[PDB]
Design a protein around this ligand. Structure first.
Ligand code: BCL
Ligand code: BCL
Ligand code: BCL
Ligand code: BCL
Ligand code: BCL
Ligand code: BCL
Ligand code: BCL
Ligand code: BCL
Ligand SMILES: CCCCCC/C=C\CCCCCCCCCC(=O)O[C@H](COC(=O)CCCCCCCCCCCCCCC)COP(=O)(O)OC[C@@H](O)CO
Ligand SMILES: CCCCCC/C=C\CCCCCCCCCC(=O)O[C@H](COC(=O)CCCCCCCCCCCCCCC)COP(=O)(O)OC[C@@H](O)CO
Ligand SMILES: [Fe+3]
Lengths: 306, 47, 64, 32, 38, 49, 294, 38, 49, 38, 38, 38, 49, 38, 38, 49, 38, 49, 38, 49
């Protein structure tokens, strides 16, 4: 019903650009399969590419203006250059001088367009091949947090200055500044839920990978074939965890667990970040009203000073 | 004065109750379906 | 720090530099604050917990 | 004193690093 | 028929739209025209 | 399959034609309303000045 | 009739057959291959109480578990009297006391809790080695767990001993170890700028990404009739590379293991050799290539 | 079929909606019209 | 599949038609209520001023 | 049966219990009733 | 059998032990009995 | 059997125990009864 | 599929010709409007000065 | 066959467009021409 | 057969372009030529 | 591939030869223009001094 | 046979180019030659 | 596969030989120019001093 | 092969190059030779 | 094959031998130049003093 060959080679707009496949070699010896092969370009594929190339061009040219078009200095201070959103004056106004904050707005707009078109590409290419569309919905879950950071949170605060600034060290600075601004960002409870889910996600990943590699000898890696008929490998993998921690899951459930942990991470993160600027101005002062701050009447500060 | 304010409950005890309940229910259901009876390959042959 | 930067001495300084939870200041003010704080850090030999108790920055418990 | 013990503890940290490398090299060898 | 016509029209209408938008943004942000309270 | 005129026969199916008619009608109505709304916001306060 | 399947689907009618679970436990018991019995000639317990396998390593672990929980409850409930887990804090002995520990001085119960917890964790690790040894699978899970155990060892044994104060171990207690983390992070300015730190968080985010992608890939092909090359073709259409079935699990294992190792390195180093992280990057500006062009 | 009609209507309705939204936002934030307390 | 008129026969099934009717009726009612509500908040305090 | 009956009773009991508990905790913490030394 | 007897005795002796320990801790830490230098 | 009896008794005894414990804790910590040096 | 002239026969299909016509017409109209708009914003305030 | 013509035209028009854009940005930002309020 | 001609021309035209651009930027930023208001 | 001389027969195909002629001609022209431009900027203001 | 010739020429022309560039940068930035306004 | 001398026959293919020749010639020319340029940079201002 | 020959030559040329570069940089930065304005 | 002497036959292939020879010659030349350069750097200004 579905021809894979006509879906691997089909000219342009409806086909792949890099028709000849290639071999990486060292990837083959350590990563399993090691062929690069063709990459499909569609209608949605060309749009995200050109919009991302526009935003990156806008940002890269504006770096050069800051250094005076000096390539020696440009290469030296590349990692601490950035472009910043408008200041608190003219908070939401769109008419700002190019050098002060005007370059940031166009770049962020083209970045948004590229992201949404990439989502559409994911969805359409998933439907075309006959497989389900779960990856697209997960990407949407991550886009929720992405859009809260850059669009929804600066809006509803009145300032475009709340968003980050398109720099390598600028993002660390943004994290630090927001946490300091709200005050004791550790106390935010949805931040606690997000950390719980993130560390659970890393836990699950390491465990699933490790057990599957250990039981590889019996061809337990092919998770699709095992779903119809469980071989000796899957039978051993269940028994190992049953004796250690008292319960276990087959090959179908464990991937549900993985998916849901990874998605809850980003959803709880977005919900928790949105509330910081609007409902609860100070998080630590809120925690002492919820009776969850350690009393610490007199600490031993000799440790912290040198 | 002795009691945690409102929104202490909503913000901190929706997580602390809901997450523990969710884990204890989801584990029951996954382990049930896993230890249930369905198609497998024989231990005496495949291994 | 940027080389053009200097310690801003045209402020009342009984608490004029405060930024926590103010809701009328954005990340630009916080950046200026952190510049001044790192300067105070390099001037003093000790570290940043010399006088702050980083759990709550507006607290005055260290007395330094 | 301080520095002898410090170097000796850094040894243990690198030893913790060690097993992962053996895993990688075993996979490289036994998968020609 | 090596060159697909539709690829040409797609890239043309994308490049034109992006270029109009970029010029419109630059001119607005330059603040040299007294347009929308300037 | 044969309701569309000959000039546009290779392009449009039969069902695709009626939808194209709805789209054209909606676009014309929207343009008329847009022009009216624009005339009204200048009679209010001009933007170019 | 209907064939129950592992994914819950019931098929409308292969060496596969419907086998109840118990059968596969009795066949894979094989008692006597314990890592400990190798060294002693015998294992003391090995009797699978309930669903749990018991070994010599399991018993020392359970000792550690019970004693640690009891000492944790004794601290903060007695001698503090808060009766709220979130409010209680279990604190290490002061820095003035030094490396030596004394029953009369405070912090004696924190030390007991820490030692019991270490015993329990190591016993658990050995028990995992053991149970894997009986099944003859392989040693990957013990390695992956040993990584995080080594992180715990660095935080509570190596870094305090190198400085020598014993007060440097992070205080136990919910919502108070966070205060320690926050006071240590700011003690050395710009912990973000720390290079070994930044690699850990890079690997953490990359791990969450890999997990989401693998889960969605397997869930998408779960219940449908396809060639099994459809997922590979989809992966080649998006980003132009398909890792394979055996490849993704290796990568999961490796990234997971590497994150914690870089992290424990960064913290041990910050305590002992680097006072602040901004001074570390002072050398970059003066690299000869560009030291005078400004 | 070289051109699918539905792709055209999809991209048309997306571009039009985005463009209306962007213009509305810019005009509101310019503060030059005395609309909603300005 | 024969309750829908001929001009819209290739598009709409039989069941899809009655739903469409419900949707149109609901949309008309909603528009009437929306117009009334906007006349009212206007009379209260105008927003263009 | 469009629904399993037991799912309905499970979700009903859970929602009712949570709702009673939340209301009882809000009313107690409001401090407006002079109940248990208030 | 609808219930395994040994599960009942296991959970019973665990719950009883935990409960005795918790009550003994709370009473000791309350400091209201003059027991072991109080 | 649509509903297993033992599930009902398990959830019943868990909910009852948790509820007794929570009420006992709240009443003790309210400090309104002069019980154990209050 | 022989509606295109012989000089351009190898390149254009039959359907690809009518769209090319639409594209050319739209481009000409757009250029005329662009020229008019440029003359107007120069009469307003010149940009080179 | 040895050199696809369309690859040449694609890379040509991309390089030309990027180069025109870069030169116009540099000339505008140099501030040496009195163009758009300079 | 061993050395593909097109790889040579690709790398040649990339290296040459990058080198021209770098030299042009260094000479402009040196400020020693009185070119574009210097 | 028989248009290329014998000494370069293995290295070059027959299409690869003409493009290589174009490349050589372009390189020679570019070098001449580069030399002229360098003589000019030097006459303007010398760099070595 | 023990070595592919093209790997040698690739690594040679990369190392040589990098080395020329690095030496040129160091000599320019040393400021000891009076070259381009120094 | 037989244009290279016997001593170097196991190493070099036929095509790999002519490139080697080009590489050697280019390297010799580059070395001569490099020597001339250093003699000139020395006569201008010595670096060791 | 107890040691592939090419691994030996690769590691040899890498170590030699790194060592020459490091010694050079140390000697230059020591400032004890009056070389390039010192 | 068989060009390498018997004592080193189990280690070296045929092709690996000539490369080696090149490596030894280059190393000897480099050592001679290094010794000369060191004698010169010493005559200029000694470093041990
Ligand atoms: C006021 C003068 C400002 C300035 C402001 C702008 C702005 C603002 C714009 C331009 C644009 C252009 N300018 Mg100007 N421009 C200035 C100075 C210059 C100078 C110079 C002196 O050197 C030059 C060479 C140009 C040259 C140009 C062209 C590159 C470009 C449009 C050419 C063309 O016709 O469009 C090519 C052909 C078309 C665009 C086809 C149009 C297609 C159809 C008609 C679009 C219809 C859209 C419709 C509304 C959508 C709904 C339709 C549905 C059917 C309902 N400008 C000064 C600084 N200039 C325009 C641009 O390129 O955007 C595209 C742009 O918006
Ligand atoms: C600033 C001064 C005036 C102002 C000046 C103007 C002017 C001037 C105009 C508007 C226009 C409009 N304004 Mg306004 N506007 C103001 C304040 C407001 C306020 C409010 C909060 O106060 C609102 C709600 C609006 C809302 C609107 C809409 C009535 C209208 C825009 C239509 C459009 O963009 O959609 C178009 C959306 C799309 C193109 C797609 C539509 C989707 C279809 C209909 C849904 C069916 C889709 C179908 C199922 C197929 C599915 C495909 C999917 C796309 C995938 N304005 C202020 C007061 N406003 C414009 C308008 O009326 O013209 C019609 C107009 O010209
Ligand atoms: C201002 C404060 C600084 C900060 C200061 C620190 C400090 C200080 C540290 C980290 C460390 C970590 N931080 Mg940091 N960190 C900050 C900002 C961040 C940000 C962010 C987005 O901004 C991120 C993602 C991280 C991420 C991380 C990772 C680099 C690392 C995680 C610890 C871990 O893996 O090992 C932790 C491993 C263990 C301790 C787990 C041991 C668990 C044992 C084996 C299990 C016991 C069983 C238990 C009882 C449960 C029993 C089960 C039964 C069910 C009950 N940090 C801020 C900037 N960060 C930590 C690290 O380096 O790790 C060493 C640390 O030292
Ligand atoms: C007050 C004057 C403000 C300004 C404010 C706005 C605002 C605000 C808007 C525009 C919009 C437009 N403006 Mg204006 N605009 C100004 C100055 C200009 C200038 C200039 C002087 O150069 C130009 C050229 C334009 C040109 C334009 C067009 C690009 C665009 C709409 C054209 C069209 O008809 O829509 C194309 C055709 C349609 C939109 C089809 C509509 C489709 C149907 C009718 C939508 C129905 C939506 C319905 C409510 C959904 C529910 C229906 C269900 C069935 C129930 N404006 C000044 C600054 N302008 C509008 C925009 O594009 O958004 C669409 C927009 O909202
Ligand atoms: C003193 C007045 C306080 C207030 C305090 C409370 C408190 C406190 C509670 C309510 C609850 C309710 N309130 Mg009131 N409430 C107030 C003002 C209002 C207002 C208003 C003016 O608008 C409204 C509309 C309501 C409306 C309501 C209903 C939503 C709800 C219970 C309805 C019902 O019968 O239960 C629906 C039906 C039942 C609950 C079935 C009960 C099932 C069986 C009988 C439970 C037995 C439990 C048993 C003890 C367990 C052991 C049994 C074993 C067999 C041994 N309240 C003011 C603020 N209100 C109650 C709530 O919903 O909790 C559920 C709640 O606890
Ligand atoms: C001095 C009074 C203190 C107080 C201090 C304590 C302390 C301390 C304890 C209790 C315990 C209990 N208290 Mg009291 N208690 C107080 C006020 C109260 C009040 C009240 C006024 O409302 C009530 C209702 C209770 C009620 C209770 C019961 C819930 C419970 C024991 C009941 C029973 O017989 O055990 C149920 C049946 C048994 C325990 C079976 C015993 C099994 C065998 C005999 C155990 C032998 C152990 C043996 C040593 C091990 C070695 C044997 C080997 C063979 C060698 N207390 C006041 C505050 N209360 C005890 C508790 O529950 O611990 C379990 C507990 O330790
Ligand atoms: C005012 C003088 C400024 C300056 C400002 C600029 C600017 C600004 C530009 C150039 C550009 C160029 N300059 Mg100059 N330039 C200066 C000094 C110099 C000096 C010097 C003294 O040494 C040199 C050698 C050059 C040399 C050059 C060439 C490298 C380049 C264009 C050559 C060519 O014809 O285009 C090659 C051939 C073409 C570009 C083909 C054009 C293709 C078609 C005609 C494009 C049509 C576009 C159309 C509008 C799109 C819509 C069409 C649809 C059909 C509707 N300039 C000084 C500093 N120079 C231009 C550049 O390269 O951008 C491309 C550029 O924009
Ligand atoms: C004014 C003197 C400035 C200086 C400024 C520059 C600038 C600026 C440039 C150079 C460039 C070069 N300089 Mg100088 N240069 C200086 C001092 C030196 C010194 C020194 C004293 O030691 C040296 C050795 C050099 C040496 C060189 C070469 C490395 C290089 C060009 C050589 C060649 O011909 O191009 C190799 C061959 C060619 C470039 C082939 C050209 C290909 C075709 C002709 C390109 C046509 C482009 C066309 C416009 C595109 C449109 C065509 C379409 C068909 C329409 N310069 C001083 C500091 N020098 C140029 C560079 O390399 O860029 C390439 C460069 O732009
Ligand atoms: C500091 C500047 C404060 C400006 C506050 C502000 O400007 O608030 C914004 C609204 O602006 C508006 O109407 C304009 C708001 C004008 C100021 C009103 C007072 C805000 C109080 C700030 C505290 C917030 O966006 P919202 O409209 O909430 O919707 C966005 C969310 O739904 C996204 O999911
Ligand atoms: C009282 C104890 C206190 C110290 C606590 C230490 C905690 C953490 C730090 C060290 C980490 C401990 C984890 C050790 C896990 C040992 C695992 C092991 O011993 O693994 C073996 C050797 O690894 C190796 O280098 C193991 C190398 C270990 C180095 C020494 C540690 C290798 O097994 P594999 O050949 O991969 O099996 C492959 C399968 O496919 C076979 O089919
Ligand atoms: Fe899996």
């Amino acid at each position: 019903p579905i021809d894979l060959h006509d879906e691997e080679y089909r000219d342009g707009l409806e086909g792949t650009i890099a028709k000849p496949p290639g071999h990486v070699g060292w990837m083959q010896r350590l990563l399993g399969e090691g062929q690069v092969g063709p990459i499909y370009v569609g209608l949605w594929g060309v749009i995200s590419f050109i919009t991302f190339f526009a935003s990156a061009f806008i940002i890269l040219v504006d770096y050069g203006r800051q250094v005076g078009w000096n390539p020696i200095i440009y290469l030296r201070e590349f990692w601490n250059l950035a472009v910043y959103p408008p200041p608190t004056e003219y908070g939401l106004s769109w008419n700002v001088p190019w050098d002060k904050g005007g370059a940031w707005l166009a770049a962020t707009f083209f970045l948004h367009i590229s992201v949404l078109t990439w989502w559409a590409r994911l969805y359409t290419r998933a439907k075309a091949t006959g497989v389900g569309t779960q990856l697209a919905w997960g990407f949407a879950s991550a886009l929720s947090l992405y859009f809260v950071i850059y669009l929804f949170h600066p809006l509803a605060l009145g300032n475009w200055s709340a968003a980050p600034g398109h720099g390598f060290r600028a993002i660390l600075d943004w994290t630090n500044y927001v946490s300091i601004h709200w005050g004791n960002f550790y106390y935010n409870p949805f931040h606690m839920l997000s950390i719980f889910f993130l560390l659970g996600s890393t836990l699950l990943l390491a465990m699933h990978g490790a057990t599957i590699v250990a039981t590889s000898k019996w061809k337990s890696e092919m998770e699709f074939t095992e779903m119809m008929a469980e071989g000796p490998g899957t039978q051993r993998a269940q028994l190992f965890w049953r004796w250690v921690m008292g319960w276990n899951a087959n090959s179908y459930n464990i991937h549900i667990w993985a998916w849901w942990f990874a998605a809850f991470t980003a959803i709880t993160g977005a919900i928790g970040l949105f509330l910081s600027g609007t409902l609860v101005p100070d998080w630590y002062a809120w925690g002492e009203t919820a009776k969850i701050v350690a009393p610490w009447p007199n600490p031993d500060w000799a440790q912290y000073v040198f | 004065s002795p009691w945690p304010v409102w929104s202490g409950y909503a913000l901190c005890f929706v997580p602390l109750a809901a997450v523990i309940l969710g884990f204890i229910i989801a584990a029951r259901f996954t382990d049930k379906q896993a230890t249930s009876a369905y198609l497998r390959l024989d231990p005496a042959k495949a291994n | 720090l940027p080389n053009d930067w200097r310690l801003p001495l045209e402020l009342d300084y009984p608490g004029g530099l405060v930024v926590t939870g103010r809701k009328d200041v954005s990340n630009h003010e916080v950046e200026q604050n952190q510049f001044a704080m790192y300067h105070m850090n390099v001037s003093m030999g000790q570290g940043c917990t010399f006088c702050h108790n980083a759990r709550y920055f507006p607290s005055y418990e260290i007395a330094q | 004193m301080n520095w002898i013990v410090a170097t000796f503890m850094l040894m243990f940290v690198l030893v913790a690093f060690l097993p992962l490398v053996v895993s990688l090299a075993y996979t490289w060898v036994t998968n020609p | 028929r090596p060159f697909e016509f539709r690829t040409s029209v797609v890239v043309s209408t994308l490049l034109g739209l992006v270029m109009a938008l970029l010029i419109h943004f630059v001119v607005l942000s330059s603040g040299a025209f007294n347009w929308l309270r300037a | 399959n044969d309701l569309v005129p000959d000039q546009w026969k290779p392009l449009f199916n039969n069902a695709q034609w009626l939808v194209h008619d709805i789209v054209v009608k909606t676009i014309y109505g929207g343009l008329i309303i847009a022009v009216i709304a624009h005339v009204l916001c200048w009679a209010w306060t001009p933007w170019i000045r | 009739r209907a064939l129950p399947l592992p994914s819950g689907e019931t098929l409308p009618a292969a060496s596969a057959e419907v086998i109840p679970f118990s059968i596969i436990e009795e066949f894979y018991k094989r008692p006597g291959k314990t890592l400990a019995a190798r060294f002693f000639g015998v294992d003391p317990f090995d009797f699978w109480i309930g669903r749990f396998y018991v070994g010599l390593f399991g018993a020392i672990s359970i000792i550690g578990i019970i004693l640690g929980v009891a000492f944790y409850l004794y601290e903060g409930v007695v001698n503090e009297g808060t009766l709220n887990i979130l409010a209680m804090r279990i604190e290490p002995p002061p820095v003035s006391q030094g490396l030596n520990v004394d029953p009369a001085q405070p912090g004696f119960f924190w030390f007991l809790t820490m030692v019991a917890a270490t015993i329990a964790f190591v016993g658990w690790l050995l028990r995992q080695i053991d149970i894997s040894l009986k099944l003859d699978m392989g040693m990957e899970v013990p390695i992956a767990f040993g990584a995080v155990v080594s992180s715990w060892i660095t935080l509570q044994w190596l870094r305090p001993i190198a400085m020598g104060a014993w007060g440097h171990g992070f205080p136990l207690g919910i919502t108070h170890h966070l205060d320690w983390v926050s006071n240590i992070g700011y003690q050395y300015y710009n912990f973000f700028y720390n290079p070994f730190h930044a690699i850990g968080i890079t690997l953490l985010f990359a791990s969450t990404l890999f997990l989401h992608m693998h889960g969605s890939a397997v869930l998408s092909e779960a219940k449908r009739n396809i060639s099994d090359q459809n997922i590979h073709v989809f992966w080649r259409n998006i980003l132009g590379y398909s890792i394979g079935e055996i490849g993704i699990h290796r990568v999961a294992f490796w990234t997971g293991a590497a994150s914690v190792l870089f992290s424990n390195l960064c913290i041990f180093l910050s305590g002992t050799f680097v006072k602040d992280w901004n001074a570390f990057w002072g050398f970059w500006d003066k690299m000869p290539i560009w030291n005078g062009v400004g």
